[PDB]
């Protein structure tokens, strides 16, 4: 209870205090990063109904939705990848673990045809892309103004010294969007054709893949990595950096990525009254989702080994996956246990009995067509609809149309019964069908949907 | 692919659909519970700067600067899962009973005296007329308390019969009575836990910053080792043996079956208030009651985990402090046997951290345990990096809350600028996070705190 005398000091202007706080966070990124960044990720993903729907309806950097009512819990994977990059430019135990991880990823998930190309051809964004990026935002005229203003020479890579920031942020935002598009394209090239990602895939196109490969009685395996804080794991971060490098993210690109994203850290104050959801925000969130998907595949590669390679159909996006035709064994369980302790668990599901789960939905067999499909989880949706929300007529209509789309799937005459069975099987709850009927009531009109929020 | 034809299907009255959703969640509690409940817990706790500040400044159910934390709350529904364990209780799950019974043995042997269990077993918790009247008198004055007592036919010097507010469903005309009753349960649970815990084991259910600093000062010296068990990654709320451990210790403290029935009945009704949502969380007394009970069980399981991992080293520690998921244990250093006990039991979901006063600062409730370089006396100082992170939250205008937040920041900056604190705090922040000298941030936050006009620069516009 003996405190020394307190003598506070301060700056002569609050704007000095703002700049000092922003500058401090800028200078100390990536070592630390504000949790407001991932809170903003969660808020955006929750508002657009999750990862796949966010990627599929991307307004700034594109390429019925797959919608999930599961709350987002994003961690700053990209921050820790950049921490690994700084540490690389002793812990050879980490290096040997990450190297083995990359070996498993290549051996069991990838072809080997493209690594030489990507090594000699790092990712570089061109004038034509960033112009077409601005053209789709504001029209052909504003893009030619954009190319003239930055002195962009046609058919040339955008010079990196044209816009580095270690205010031309429109150019930097356009460049980062080109990086994400090329990363998705290059990852799609290396992955074996039975291994699918969902960076831009509608519910109908994914359902075509499910319908083709998933039959009644088929086992489906899931690796649950929700409890594994891979974003704060040293070997995972180095694995992510290593595979990004293999895909063409060289040191100039890494420097550009760290420079651009240190600038987000500097937009801490003033806060405003709501998350601004910038286009730069979305680029960082997209890159985080990309690395998470890769690490998801890496974990499945190391745990399943050849059983992943020979799977007839395996799908990955964010932290979620399903792997057809694989049943856990004890060699598999020991590998997963000795490597990641109980941070990652293996789930054995079966089409028609113990339903597989994927992106907040059930993999169900339609009882009329005998065709498998993904159906959104109605219990999660009901939970999500309880969120108190300020009045917003345009967003209310968006949410109502999303509910309408979901209820149309629930009331397919081959789905309603097996969906209620799956919900009771997964959660041990009573028959969900009265809630299905209630939610469809809300969905059919703007007036009925208003009952969810209530008066005032 | 191929979809069967969709024949969508609805009700006519939207109010009927509301009732169906509410009744469904009511009927299927505790089996499932909406995450809106724990999102509301987090929102309330973040608003009032965390667990200790929330209990220390409890508006409805309480017993100077507060122990405030800028660490975001991530609450789980521990009380839900205790009630599931109660349902499961009323042989294939024998290992669960074996594990939870061993947990309670460890809790009793290494954290408790043995004096009170017989009394609590024959005297279950029952709340009396005098408490609920005094509860209402504190809230609305002695006139309203007498009105309250007369309305419910409360007989003085007598326990409140549970048939006055629960028929098992809560009489809605007697909801104020039920909330007053649950506040009495929390106060008695805190009293009885304090009775059984060894005197060197402290909880912070009602402790000011000054009072806790007095305990830190007496016991924590320069160079003293301080152990922490990190259970933040341990999802003890959906662990079967943890939930059953919490149930049995509640029972050992006097929560018998009628009391459990009341608790499940009252909080199942909360599940039936899912819709309509309104525009913001309403908070309110029944929400706070369930949150306090969750914090209580979490604190107990926190002590349980330390008991089983540390064994006699918890018992002989000169000072161990617990609240929520956080703890510090004076004078203990991890060893191989301890790490193996922890890993074998909870498989690297609980981490043991070795701290040292003055070199690697112990961390507790979003603050550092530091030795004042001038008084040579140890104390807790709030983490300035966490506070900086928290101030970045975009917030709608609220003149009253803005002044509350500015005044709390003023108190925090006062500790940071004690002439014996600033230096070792900068070193501690750099040691913990590997960041540059935090002192410019200390000055910037003090700038915001000095006036309402300066504080407006955080939100801007
Ligand atoms: Mg390489
Ligand atoms: Mg999964
Ligand atoms: Mg007992
Ligand atoms: Mg701790």
DSSP string for residues in A393-411: HHHHHHHHHHHHHHHHHHT
B456-to-A19, A67, A276 alpha-carbon distances in Å: 14, 39, 19
> How far A230 CA sits from the closest chain B CA (Å)?
13
DSSP character for B357? T
What CA–CA distance (Å, rounded) separates A26 from A22?
6
Looking up tokens 């196109």, which residue turns up? A205
> How far B34 CA sits from the closest chain A CA (Å)?
5
Interval between CA A356 and ligand 2 midpoint (Å)? 8
A292-to-A76, A86, A98, B402, B457 alpha-carbon distances in Å: 10, 20, 15, 38, 36
To test the contact with chain A by mutation, choose from B444, B446, B454 the residue with the greatest count of A C-beta atoms within 10 A, namely: B444
Identify which ligand lies nearest to the alpha carbon of B305: 4
Give the dihedral of Cα atoms B301, B303, B304, B305; nearest 10 deg. Answer: 90
Q: Is A429 in contact with B18 (Cβ distance < 8 A)? A: no
Interface residue B57 vs chain A (CB under 8 A): no
User: % helix / strand / coil in chain A, to the nearest 5?
Assistant: 55, 10, 35
Instruction: Name the helix (H) or strand (E) containing B196.
Output: helix B175-196
**Residues A286 and A63 sit within 8 Å (Cβ to Cβ):** no
3-state secondary structure at position B222? coil
What CA–CA distance (Å, rounded) separates A50 from A319?
12
DSSP character for A110? B
What CA–CA distance (Å, rounded) separates B25 from B216?
45
What CA–CA distance (Å, rounded) separates A223 from A225?
6
Looking up tokens 């401090």, which residue turns up? A24
Interval between CA B73 and ligand 4 midpoint (Å)? 14
DSSP character for B163? G
To test the contact with chain B by mutation, choose from A10, A25, A41, A375 the residue with the greatest count of B C-beta atoms within 10 A, namely: A10
The CA-based diameter of chain A, rounded to the nearest angstrom, is 79
Strand order in the sheet with B351-356: B201-203, B320-323, B326-330, B225-230, B351-356
Q: Is B276 in contact with A367 (Cβ distance < 8 A)? A: no
Q: Is A6 in contact with B414 (Cβ distance < 8 A)? A: yes
What CA–CA distance (Å, rounded) separates B461 from B458?
9
DSSP string, A230-263: GGG-HHHHHHHHHHHHHTT--HHHHHHHHHHHHH
Interval between CA B291 and ligand 1 midpoint (Å)? 50
What CA–CA distance (Å, rounded) separates A409 from A438?
15
Q: Is B446 in contact with A36 (Cβ distance < 8 A)? A: no
* Per-residue buried b or exposed e for B340-351, using 16+ beta carbons within 10 Å of the residue's own CB: ebbbebbeebbb
Residue A361 pairs with which residues in a beta bridge?
A376
Interface residue A441 vs chain B (CB under 8 A): yes
Strand order in the sheet with A195-197: A195-197, A314-317, A320-324, A219-224, A345-350
DSSP character for B57? T
Instruction: Name the helix (H) or strand (E) containing A59.
Output: none
Torsions phi, psi for A411 (to 5 deg):
-105, 15
DSSP character for A375? E
> How far B109 CA sits from the closest chain A CA (Å)?
29
Residue B261 φ/ψ region, left for φ over 0, alpha for ψ in the -120 to 50 degree band, beta for the rest: alpha
Please enumerate in sequence order all residues whose Cβ is within 8 A of that of B244, keeping only pairs 6 or more positions apart, or say none.
Answer: B85, B88, B89, B96, B97, B99, B100
Interface residue B345 vs chain A (CB under 8 A): no
From the list B393, B34, B69, B391, the residue with the least C-alpha distance to A39 is B393
From the list B381, B384, B383, B372, the residue with the least C-alpha distance to B419 is B372
B246-to-B143, B299, B302, B386 alpha-carbon distances in Å: 39, 10, 10, 31
What CA–CA distance (Å, rounded) separates B420 from B427?
12
Q: How buried is A70 (Cβ within 10 angstroms: 0-12 exposed, 13-18 middle, 19+ buried)?
A: buried
**Residues B314 and B329 sit within 8 Å (Cβ to Cβ):** yes
Structure tokens at A405: 């789309």
From the list A39, A2, A47, the residue with the least C-alpha distance to A399 is A47
Interval between CA A225 and ligand 2 midpoint (Å)? 8
Q: Is A1 in contact with B217 (Cβ distance < 8 A)? A: yes
Q: Within A269-415, where are the H helices?
A: 279-304, 306-309, 330-340, 378-385, 393-410
To test the contact with chain B by mutation, choose from A7, A13, A17 the residue with the greatest count of B C-beta atoms within 10 A, namely: A17
3-state secondary structure at position B369? strand
Of B11, B282, B415, the CB nearest to A437: B11
Contacts of A228 in chain B (CB under 8 A): none
DSSP character for B59? S
Identify which ligand lies nearest to the alpha carbon of A224: 2
User: Using only C-alpha atoms, what is the Rg of chain A?
Assistant: 24
What CA–CA distance (Å, rounded) separates B336 from B354?
13
Q: Helices (H), strands (E): how many in chain A?
A: 20, 7
What CA–CA distance (Å, rounded) separates A334 from A353?
26
**Residues B457 and A17 sit within 8 Å (Cβ to Cβ):** yes
Q: Is A453 in contact with B276 (Cβ distance < 8 A)? A: yes
Please enumerate in sequence order all residues whose Cβ is within 8 A of that of A442, keeping only pairs 6 or more positions apart, or say none.
Answer: A385, A400, A403, A448, A449, A451, A452, B14, B17
Give the dihedral of Cα atoms A344, A348, A353, A354; nearest 10 deg. Answer: -10
Cα within 13 Å of Cα(A273), Cβ side: 6
Interval between CA B241 and ligand 3 midpoint (Å)? 14
Contacts of B397 in chain A (CB under 8 A): 273
**Residues A328 and A354 sit within 8 Å (Cβ to Cβ):** no
Name the residue of chain B whose CA is nearest to A1's CA.
B214
Residue A376 pairs with which residues in a beta bridge?
A361
Q: Is B276 in contact with A452 (Cβ distance < 8 A)? A: yes
Beta strand segments in B102-204, E: 201-203
Identify which ligand lies nearest to the alpha carbon of A359: 2
Experimental approach taken: X-ray
**Which are the residues after which chain B is interrupted (C to N > 2.5 Å)?**
63, 90, 167
Please enumerate in sequence order all residues whose Cβ is within 8 A of that of B136, keeping only pairs 6 or more positions apart, or say none.
Answer: B144, B145, B148, B149, B176, B180
Q: Is B394 in contact with A275 (Cβ distance < 8 A)? A: yes
Contacts of B347 in chain A (CB under 8 A): 341-342
**Residues B79 and B297 sit within 8 Å (Cβ to Cβ):** yes
A245-to-A116, A122, A227, A233, B328 alpha-carbon distances in Å: 12, 8, 27, 18, 42
Contacts of B2 in chain A (CB under 8 A): 211, 366, 369, 371
3-state secondary structure at position B219? helix
From the list B129, B179, B138, B178, the residue with the least C-alpha distance to B158 is B129
Q: How far does chain B reach from its first CA to its final CA, in angstroms?
A: 52
Q: How many CB atoms lie within 10 A of CB B373?
A: 17
Q: How buried is B398 (Cβ within 10 angstroms: 0-12 exposed, 13-18 middle, 19+ buried)?
A: exposed
Structure tokens at A429: 């709850």
Q: Within A305-347, where are the H helices?
A: 306-309, 330-340
What CA–CA distance (Å, rounded) separates A28 from A31?
6
**Residues B323 and B299 sit within 8 Å (Cβ to Cβ):** yes
**Sign (positive/negative) of CA torsion B11, B14, B16, B18?**
positive
B166-to-A403, B70, B126, B154 alpha-carbon distances in Å: 37, 39, 14, 15
Resolution (A): 1.9
A432-to-B15, B27, B361 alpha-carbon distances in Å: 18, 12, 52
Interface of A with B in 407-426 (CB under 8 A): 407-409, 411-415
A226-to-A302, A320, A349, B417, B440 alpha-carbon distances in Å: 17, 8, 17, 41, 38
* Per-residue buried b or exposed e for A253-283, using 16+ beta carbons within 10 Å of the residue's own CB: bbbbbbebbbbbbbbbbbbeeebeeebbbbb
Looking up tokens 């789930």, which residue turns up? A347
Residues listed for chain A: 456
To test the contact with chain B by mutation, choose from A5, A18, A24, A414 the residue with the greatest count of B C-beta atoms within 10 A, namely: A24
**Which are the residues after which chain A is interrupted (C to N > 2.5 Å)?**
63, 89, 166
B420-to-A2, A6, B320, B371 alpha-carbon distances in Å: 11, 9, 25, 8
Name the residue of chain A whose CA is nearest to B381's CA.
A3
What CA–CA distance (Å, rounded) separates B421 from B388?
18
**Sign (positive/negative) of CA torsion A289, A119, A88, A173?**
negative
Q: How buried is A173 (Cβ within 10 angstroms: 0-12 exposed, 13-18 middle, 19+ buried)?
A: buried
What CA–CA distance (Å, rounded) separates B429 from A52?
39
What CA–CA distance (Å, rounded) separates B374 from B419?
7
What CA–CA distance (Å, rounded) separates B309 from B293?
24
**Sign (positive/negative) of CA torsion A150, A154, A160, A161?**
negative
What CA–CA distance (Å, rounded) separates A235 from A67?
31
Residues listed for chain B: 461
3-state secondary structure at position B136? helix
């Amino acid at each position: 209870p003996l405190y020394s005398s307190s003598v506070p000091a301060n700056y002569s202007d609050p704007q000095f205090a703002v700049a000092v706080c922003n500058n401090y966070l800028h200078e100390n990124y990536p070592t630390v990063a504000s949790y407001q960044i991932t809170d903003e990720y969660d808020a955006y993903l929750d508002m657009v109904d999750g990862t796949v729907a966010c990627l599929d309806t991307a307004t700034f950097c594109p390429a019925p939705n797959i919608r999930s009512a599961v709350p987002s819990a994003m961690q700053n994977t990209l921050q820790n990848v950049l921490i690994a990059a700084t540490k690389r430019n002793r812990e050879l135990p980490t290096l040997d673990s990450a190297t083995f991880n990359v070996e498993c990823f290549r051996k069991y998930a990838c072809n080997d045809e493209y690594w030489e190309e990507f090594a000699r051809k790092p990712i570089r964004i061109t004038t034509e892309f960033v112009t077409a990026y601005v053209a789709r935002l504001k029209g052909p005229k504003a893009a030619a103004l954009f190319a003239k203003t930055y002195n962009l020479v046609p058919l040339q890579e955008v010079p990196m010294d044209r816009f580095v920031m270690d205010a031309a942020e429109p150019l930097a935002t356009a460049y980062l969007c080109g990086i994400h598009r090329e990363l998705v394209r290059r990852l799609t090239a290396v992955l074996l054709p039975n291994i699918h990602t969902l960076f831009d895939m509608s519910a109908e196109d994914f359902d075509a893949i499910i319908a083709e490969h998933f039959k009644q009685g088929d086992p489906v395996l899931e690796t649950d990595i929700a409890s594994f804080d891979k974003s704060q794991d040293d070997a995972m971060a180095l694995t992510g950096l290593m595979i990004l490098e293999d895909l063409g993210v060289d040191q100039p690109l890494l420097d550009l990525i760290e420079c651009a994203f240190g600038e987000i850290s500097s937009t801490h104050l003033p806060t405003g009254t709501r998350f601004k959801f910038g286009a730069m925000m979305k680029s960082g969130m997209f890159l985080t989702l990309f690395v998470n998907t890769v690490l998801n595949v890496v974990i499945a590669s190391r745990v399943l080994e050849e059983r992943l390679k020979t799977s007839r159909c395996a799908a990955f996006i964010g932290d979620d996956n399903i792997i057809h035709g694989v049943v856990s064994d004890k060699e598999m369980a020991e590998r997963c246990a000795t490597w990641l302790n109980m941070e990652v668990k293996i789930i054995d599901a079966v089409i028609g009995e113990r339903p597989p789960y994927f992106c907040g939905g059930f993999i169900l067999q339609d009882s009329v067509t005998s065709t498998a499909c993904r159906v959104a989880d109605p219990l999660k949706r009901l939970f999500k609809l309880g969120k108190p929300l300020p009045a917003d007529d345009e967003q209310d209509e968006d949410r109502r149309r999303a509910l309408l789309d979901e209820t149309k799937a629930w009331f397919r005459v081959g789905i309603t019964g097996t969906l209620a069975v799956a919900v009771t099987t997964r959660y041990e709850v009573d028959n969900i069908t009265p809630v299905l009927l209630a939610l469809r009531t809300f969905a059919q009109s703007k007036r009925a949907f208003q009952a969810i929020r209530g008066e005032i």
